[PDB]
Amino acid sequence: GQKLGSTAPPAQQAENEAKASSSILINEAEPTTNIQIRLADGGRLVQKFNHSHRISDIRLFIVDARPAMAATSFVLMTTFPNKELADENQTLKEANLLNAVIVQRLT
Amino acid sequence: PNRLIVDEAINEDNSVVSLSQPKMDELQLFRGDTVLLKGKKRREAVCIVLSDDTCSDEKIRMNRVVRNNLRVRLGDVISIQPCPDVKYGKRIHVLPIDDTVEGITGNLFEVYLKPYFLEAYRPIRKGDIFLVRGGMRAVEFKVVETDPSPYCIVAPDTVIHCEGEPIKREDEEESLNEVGYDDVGGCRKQLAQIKEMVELPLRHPALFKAIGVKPPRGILLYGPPGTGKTLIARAVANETGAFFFLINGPEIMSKLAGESESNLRKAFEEAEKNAPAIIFIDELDAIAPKREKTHGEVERRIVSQLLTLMDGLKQRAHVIVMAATNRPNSIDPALRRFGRFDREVDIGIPDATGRLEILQIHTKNMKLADDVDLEQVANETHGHVGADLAALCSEAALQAIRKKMDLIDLEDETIDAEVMNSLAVTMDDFRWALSQ
Amino acid sequence: KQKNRPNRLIVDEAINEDNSVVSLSQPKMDELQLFRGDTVLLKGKKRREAVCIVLSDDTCSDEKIRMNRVVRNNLRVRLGDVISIQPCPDVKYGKRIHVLPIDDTVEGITGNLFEVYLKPYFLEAYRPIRKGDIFLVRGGMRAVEFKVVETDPSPYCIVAPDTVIHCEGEPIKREDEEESLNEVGYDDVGGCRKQLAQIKEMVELPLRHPALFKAIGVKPPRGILLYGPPGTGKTLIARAVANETGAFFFLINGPEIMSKLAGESESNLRKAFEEAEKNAPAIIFIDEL
Ligand SMILES: Nc1ncnc2c1ncn2[C@@H]1O[C@H](COP(=O)(O)OP(=O)(O)O)[C@@H](O)[C@H]1O
Ligand SMILES: Nc1ncnc2c1ncn2[C@@H]1O[C@H](COP(=O)(O)OP(=O)(O)O)[C@@H](O)[C@H]1O
Numbered sequence A: 001g002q003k004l005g006s007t008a009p010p011a012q013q014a015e016n017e018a019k020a021s022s023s024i025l026i027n028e029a030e031p032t033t034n035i036q037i038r039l040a041d042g043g044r045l046v047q048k049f050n051h052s053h054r055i056s057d058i059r060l061f062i063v064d065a066r067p068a069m070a071a072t073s074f075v076l077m078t079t080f081p082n083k084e085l086a087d088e089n090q091t092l093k094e095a096n097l098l099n100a101v102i103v104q105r106l107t
Numbered sequence B: 001p002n003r004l005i006v007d008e009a010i011n012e013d014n015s016v017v018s019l020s021q022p023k024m025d026e027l028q029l030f031r032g033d034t035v036l037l038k039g040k041k042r043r044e045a046v047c048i049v050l051s052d053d054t055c056s057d058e059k060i061r062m063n064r065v066v067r068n069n070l071r072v073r074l075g076d077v078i079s080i081q082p083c084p085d086v087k088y089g090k091r092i093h094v095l096p097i098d099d100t101v102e103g104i105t106g107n108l109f110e111v112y113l114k115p116y117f118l119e120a121y122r123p124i125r126k127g128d129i130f131l132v133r134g135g136m137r138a139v140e141f142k143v144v145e146t147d148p149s150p151y152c153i154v155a156p157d158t159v160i161h162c163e164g165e166p167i168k169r170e171d172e173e174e175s176l177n178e179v180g181y182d183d184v185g186g187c188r189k190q191l192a193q194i195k196e197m198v199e200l201p202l203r204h205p206a207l208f209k210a211i212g213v214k215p216p217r218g219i220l221l222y223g224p225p226g227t228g229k230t231l232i233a234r235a236v237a238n239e240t241g242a243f244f245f246l247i248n249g250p251e252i253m254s255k256l257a258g259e260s261e262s263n264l265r266k267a268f269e270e271a272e273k274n275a276p277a278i279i280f281i282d283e284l285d286a287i288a289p290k291r292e293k294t295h296g297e298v299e300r301r302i303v304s305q306l307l308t309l310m311d312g313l314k315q316r317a318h319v320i321v322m323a324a325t326n327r328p329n330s331i332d333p334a335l336r337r338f339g340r341f342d343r344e345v346d347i348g349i350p351d352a353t354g355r356l357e358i359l360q361i362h363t364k365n366m367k368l369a370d371d372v373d374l375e376q377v378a379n380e381t382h383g384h385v386g387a388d389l390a391a392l393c394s395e396a397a398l399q400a401i402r403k404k405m406d407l408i409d410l411e412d413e414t415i416d417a418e419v420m421n422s423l424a425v426t427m428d429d430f431r432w433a434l435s436q
Numbered sequence C: 001k002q003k004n005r006p007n008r009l010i011v012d013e014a015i016n017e018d019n020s021v022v023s024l025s026q027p028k029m030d031e032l033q034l035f036r037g038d039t040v041l042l043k044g045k046k047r048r049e050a051v052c053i054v055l056s057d058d059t060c061s062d063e064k065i066r067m068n069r070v071v072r073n074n075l076r077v078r079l080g081d082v083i084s085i086q087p088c089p090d091v092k093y094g095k096r097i098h099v100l101p102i103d104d105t106v107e108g109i110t111g112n113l114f115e116v117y118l119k120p121y122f123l124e125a126y127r128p129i130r131k132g133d134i135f136l137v138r139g140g141m142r143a144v145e146f147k148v149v150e151t152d153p154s155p156y157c158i159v160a161p162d163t164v165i166h167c168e169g170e171p172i173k174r175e176d177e178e179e180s181l182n183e184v185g186y187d188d189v190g191g192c193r194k195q196l197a198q199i200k201e202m203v204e205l206p207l208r209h210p211a212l213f214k215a216i217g218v219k220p221p222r223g224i225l226l227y228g229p230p231g232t233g234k235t236l237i238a239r240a241v242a243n244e245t246g247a248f249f250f251l252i253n254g255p256e257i258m259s260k261l262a263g264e265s266e267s268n269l270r271k272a273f274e275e276a277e278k279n280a281p282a283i284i285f286i287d288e289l
Helices: A013-021 A055-065 B021-025 B064-069 B113-117 B189-203 B229-239 B259-273 B297-312 B352-361 B374-379 B386-405 B417-422 B427-434 C026-032 C069-074 C113-122 C194-208 C210-214 C234-243 C254-259 C262-278
Strands: A035-039 A044-047 A075-078 A083-085 A100-105 B004-007 B036-039 B043-046 B059-061 B077-081 B091-096 B123-125 B129-133 B138-147 B151-153 B159-161 B218-222 B243-248 B277-282 B319-324 B343-346 C008-012 C021-025 C039-043 C049-057 C064-067 C082-087 C096-101 C128-130 C134-139 C142-151 C156-158 C164-166 C248-253 C282-287
Touching: A013 A055, A035 A055, A044 A055, A055 A075, B043 B064, B043 B123, B064 B129, B113 B129, B113 B159, B123 B138, B138 B151, B189 B218, B189 B229, B189 B319, B189 B343, B218 B229, B229 B243, B229 B277, B229 B319, B243 B259, B259 B277, B259 B297, B259 B319, B352 B374, B352 B386, B374 B427, B386 B427, B386 C194, C021 C026, C026 C049, C049 C069, C049 C128, C069 C134, C113 C134, C113 C142, C113 C164, C128 C142, C194 C210, C194 C234, C234 C248, C234 C282, C248 C254, C248 C262, C254 C262, C262 C282
Parallel strands: A035 A100, B004 B059, B091 B159, B218 B319, B218 B343, B243 B277, B277 B319, C008 C064, C021 C049, C096 C164, C248 C282
Antiparallel strands: A035 A044, A075 A083, A075 A100, B004 B077, B036 B043, B036 B077, B091 B138, B123 B151, B129 B138, C008 C082, C021 C064, C039 C049, C039 C082, C096 C142, C128 C156, C134 C142
């Protein structure tokens, strides 16, 4: 069996990933950015198709993605200065995510 | 394949490597990808790839930690491949390497492993050896077990095992305790030239064995003492995997008046075996001072002996001779002749900028207090040279240990790690040192 | 103050030349509730004990305890070590006492060592002595060492005016762990405090906490250059520092070295360094470099 610490906590999510993607807006007119989402939900690798969207979208996206995620609190980060995407409001362009790898941390 | 040439590192972080946006853009590697790196004799290594602007599109800025696991020197090529399978880890078993722990007792985990992985998401491969600094030293750890297998990214959920036995340093595995370019600071222009001269002959032996061009065979480093000449020389030796042989002035001139030359000769002999080799003659003014500086026939028989061995050095069995001295005047003009030390590099004293660098290099293993302003320290050490700052640092540290020592912190009996990891050097510690 | 069990102190140099005296800072006596003359019992190394009298000190530091070499030895400690001080209200004026001089300290002189040394020494002083302690008495242009063989009221007693003093014929032998107070100490150096202080801290860690540098990457000092006119006390200092830290002391003398033939000279040089490393911690002193 296991022991404790300080951290936190079927295949139909091909549809989950589909609805996660179909949830988007992609201003043909507007410039892109793609994102590598590191789901804490495990070594869950994610691919984006964003174009200068805001963190609320990344959040709703993960929610659309994994079911659990829909109720679990967490924060989004940038590894190596390791900063935590603070104001989840701002467009990817302001945060300098443009083709980055945002890792999910369960708080 | 977009194979890259390995160059210098810029953030002291080991797990990170750097390329240029232009380089990354072509393979869709994004500002954080856990890229895989394959290289020399059965070696791979997973690392987080960021991006740099001063990096050249064909070069990849990494540190000696990676490089070594990759078994490669600055200048080689590597295949930077995106590693998608890399998944958070469940457990990992690592063990401290003897020579890097002898001295310290107590839980390593608490002092090194923990603060090292803590919310960092460091991707590690098997067999890899990483360096953890702190407690006024830098322990080396060997990854002997992972779960996920081959590799993984240590997450805040990964278990860390520190089983009870310090393993050994396999002789195919170099120490990070050895001198390298990252250990020299302030010498950029000169440290540049040296690399530039030694490059081909030390790195590409065969070339000259096919062309009729004359390579540099004797480099002469000037500069006052403590400037880092012995440092620079040994660094270049390790940095290029070249054989290093040390000949010290006093050591030679201490022998009998025959035993001396005997050595000078046996010295060059053993270097021609392990070539490419770098023969460093420290304190050359001791073996070959200028014309009028000599008094006896013996002193002269040796200087001559040295001049000869130089001329005898052929293009075949390439070895570069480096010698340091405090200034031109010192040496015997004959050593300058085309064929001998015809390549001279002047290494002065550091400036405020340079001094800063050196000070950071000599504190990388210590816990500096937030009230520590090295840049300030750098600014009030005008004359000071590398050795002065390096020593200054030792004084600060020692001064701090003396303070929190009387508190009866177990001292006098073989050491405890955590104890050393708490002791922090205050700006007052430097202040005290300065006034000494 | 939290951990020191309020009686653990660091042995510092003495200010009062009296051997029976040890000093503490007033704020320290108050904490331990001792009196300006209270007789205390000190515990050192090799499970040794000493009985001394306590006085306040304005220059003494809260954690440290001043005491001269005599007591420091009896306790088997060096400056910098720690001891436990304890009140000793059970001491009682002693009936009889038998002390004996040490062979090497009385060679040459003859006569009644009692009326010449023991008498003026204990006379109306009220010196608290333990059994086994070694005290020094100066006079007659020399200093004699005496070892308390036996005290009436057993472990320790205060030599009152009625206490019978026996010093029956015989000079005992000096044991191995018992250094001579005739050896050089910091109390034999005057006019150097500043410099004596610099040197002390320089060698402090390397010579007192060797293990430290075994587990450290910091570089301690190796060579120390002492410059000054002749007869300034450099040799004296170096020898004093060695003993005072229980380090091995090896002496190289310029002329000696230069009187030999060349190869012999080198030989000797490396021999000095060789022997030094075998008995480390050590201090090699090159006189007349
Ligand atoms: N430029 C430098 N950067 C970092 N450390 C230095 C530098 N120069 C000197 N040092 C430190 O001082 C010591 C001086 O070494 P060394 O190369 O032997 O000096 P030199 O040959 O000029 O007498 C080095 O081992 C190193 O720790
Ligand atoms: N500072 C001093 N304090 C007390 N006595 C001293 C001092 N300096 C010298 N002496 C006395 O004079 C002698 C001179 O000794 P020494 O240390 O050998 O001199 P130096 O090494 O300076 O030539 C000492 O043995 C000592 O008796």
